[PDB]
């Protein structure tokens, strides 16, 4: 009993050390990726348009999509001289086992998607879920990144949903279209001129040209096959809001929404964004804003210039 | 399940459970697990001593 | 009571111990009413709770040696040991068995 | 109906009268509204409102509850002449926390949500136990008196009174905080009881009318004197002064000359009746510049709650004594009790304070119940108890039903 | 309040029942209840554990070696009437502990 | 906003100072009785009779 009691007491001091390190990661992640409803009040603060593309800023091109589980910054070392399965004492054996299962992940942290990692991200689910997340993505990009670094284009038939877009400066130019035939004449003449997609990273961010382009597909036109089968172009990223077969044929680029608003996707490494498994699993609990809330934030942002 | 049901058990599993039962019992009355000294044990042993002393006297009368 | 840290759980244990004394004192005065009995009961009934307030106010801000703290711990065990031998005596078990 | 005028509260306390759009949704107004209150503060020369870290701006009622951001100002129960508050509410998002080993987890959680015993509470419990102790000692000493009204009772009780009072004296002069004052107040409250029976126990011969006069007299004087010098616990002391003074008059009358108890009981009822009407006037006369208003308001309230309570005790004691179910016109006191109950039931609800109105309302119910129970125990019969139970259970049920339905 | 009623009810029922089935004596029924209470004060903290459903799992690691890298349990989603927007609380296994205690 | 300004229109334009903390505190600390409470009182009264 004295040996058992001493082991339990030592194990809890290691618990406090993990919990202390976990507090530090929570504050840092919120400080760089706040909740969408708090962004309206923060518009005047110096935190707006703070992000830089010049290599050292690791958060460029990263956008908050919700909350979920993530690996903490702790690195566990295996116990030396572990007794064999028949030699393990029952109380301390299960204690060291359950301790490892729970203290190895930290709960309810903000989850993110990177624009620099894939040619497109197919959003598959009901319209309200897909548009809810998309408006959140647009206002997050707009609050953290300036118009000199990010530009946005919408191709949609349901113009009544994209009416609020009028106020944001990021949708301007030195811009909403009804069909690919229309987009092809005005916009594709510029973008089709050069390149193909190339996954980037923080250090590489210093070399790519300053205006990154985000394209929103909401028309289901078959004419999109030309750029999509060619594996895109560099400096562009597409979000398919329709769920068309041309975009939905790649699991590494598919986000699936459950009826409860839970998103599933392939797991990706926190530090390198590389895909680590081929089976889809839980990704994040979705956060979303209404058209009114989006326009409210957009009007507040429309007040400022360089 | 893993631990459910009515399967076999061993001696180490019997004392192991009694250790967890003592440790969790004081956590409900004293709200701390440090367990510097273990008074639950002593308060129980004092009752067992009381019962035994009664039986010794009781059995002593029958001998008379 | 000191084995319990909750506010109402500890107060109920202390109160229970005190009320047993008060209830016996009253019973001993009404029956067998007499000048000495009422005189003795009336003193106990006020000094006993007074000593409690005195102890409660001074104990939290004083220092005691390990030898004295160890001595108060043993009073509890010394109080438990006699209950069963005495209860069976009050029930006349030892005399009953000795005379079958 | 297109707009409503309301007062909006802003940072550190400036109230501004504004004419708001009655049908636009509230979330549309909070942004420009913040600009306006800031502009006026800047011209007034005050410091503007500002955010702190992560949070949002909201429009709330004076009680702080926020209004639903999507609803219209007319959709909510906001009327012209009301007031609202603009406020900053911080972000609540933070990491979840988990502990798996059940033994530690029970200690951690259970220690954060409840309060442990401490030395401050220990002393208050000790004070309460001695107060409870001495009233038991005076009881047995005061009980011996009905069979042996000798010097023992007064001699023994006098020393106890002096000793308890002496301790309270040192505590009152040394107390520094309200925690210390409650201990001293409980100690002082208990000193009045032994001295009262000690004085009443002095006059020899069989206990009765002549002995009673001293007790109620010293009780009235001591309670009033303690209040005068202490200035705290107004309610409990005032209530004792009323019952003490009124009982002293009745005790004196019965000792000197009284034709019947009914006469004294009827006289007391009449004295209380006029006092019930005069009650708010008595309170009003008995009761950096702003402070003068705050102190007086609660003082008057304190004296009134005790006054209405003390009168209630006298009438219930008097009426329950008057309603004999055998003597004369058995129905006369019952209907008189009915008329008395009606006045209290009808006038009690006119008072503004909850405890004063509730206590008055309850005073009527107990009288009706007590009379019913008296008519059950006395003049007992199977039909009578059956009838009593039906009346006794339906009476309060009907009172609740009238309010609940 | 309900637990208090059950204990005086149960122990008084056994007292009256003894007096009903056998004459015995009052002193014996009173002394017997005293002894039952003295032992009951020692059992109270353990008896209170099981009534609240606290369970203590014990088994030799499922007759298998430990899998440190096991996929953790899925966090549960919760809502409020006013706070209609759902938020995830945490592992279901750990939420019960905060109620059971 | 676009609004109709009648000739009769006059506006208060007056402000007053009192700490909101005290206003909100006093509002809750003392106020009139509510029917929600009376249900509990009625329930307590009927229980007493039975």
Residue numbers in the entry:
A (entry chain C2): 101 to 274, 285 to 416
B (entry chain B5): 10 to 73
C (entry chain D5): 404 to 503
D (entry chain D6): 18 to 304, 344 to 461
E (entry chain D5): 253 to 353
F (entry chain D5): 102 to 151
What does the paper say about this structure?
Specialized protein transport systems—known as type VII secretion systems (T7SSs)—are central to the virulence of this pathogen, and are also crucial for nutrient and metabolite transport across the mycobacterial cell envelope. Mycobacterium tuberculosis encodes five homologous, but functionally distinct, T7SSs that are designated ESX-1 to ESX-5. These systems translocate a number of effector proteins across the unique and impermeable diderm cell envelope. Here we reconstituted the ESX-5 T7SS of M. tuberculosis H37Rv in M. smegmatis to obtain a structural view of the entire T7SS membrane complex from this human pathogen.
The intact machinery comprises EccB5, EccC5, EccD5, EccE5 and MycP5 with a 6:6:12:6:3 stoichiometry resulting in a 2.32-MDa complex that is anchored in the inner membrane through 165 transmembrane helices (TMHs). The membrane assembly is best described as a trimer of dimers, in which each dimer comprises a single copy of MycP5 and two protomers each of one copy of EccB5, EccC5, EccE5 and two copies of EccD5. We show how the 2.32-MDa ESX-5 assembly, which contains 165 transmembrane helices, is restructured and stabilized as a trimer of dimers by the MycP5 protease. A trimer of MycP5 caps a central periplasmic dome-like chamber that is formed by three EccB5 dimers, with the proteolytic sites of MycP5 facing towards the cavity. At the membrane level, six EccD5-dimer barrels (each of which contains 22 TMHs) together form a circular raft with an inner cavity. Within this raft, inner EccD5 monomers are situated closer to the centre, whereas outer EccD5 monomers face towards the periphery of the membrane complex. Instead, coupling between two neighbouring EccD5 barrels is achieved by the N-terminal loop and α-helix of EccB5 that run parallel to the cytoplasmic side of the inner membrane and engage in interactions with the TMHs of the neighbouring EccD5 barrel in a clockwise manner. We fully resolved the twelve EccC5 TMHs in the intact M. tuberculosis ESX-5 complex; these form three four-TMH bundles, each of which belongs to the EccC5 molecules of one dimer. These bundles are held together by hydrophobic interactions and effectively seal the central space of the membrane complex, which is enclosed by the EccB5 basket. The entrance to the putative EccC5 pore widens on the cytoplasmic side, where the EccC5 stalk domains expand radially. Together, our data suggest that the six EccD5 barrels provide a stable scaffold for assembly of a secretion pore that is confined by the EccB5 TMHs and gated through three EccC5 TMH bundles.
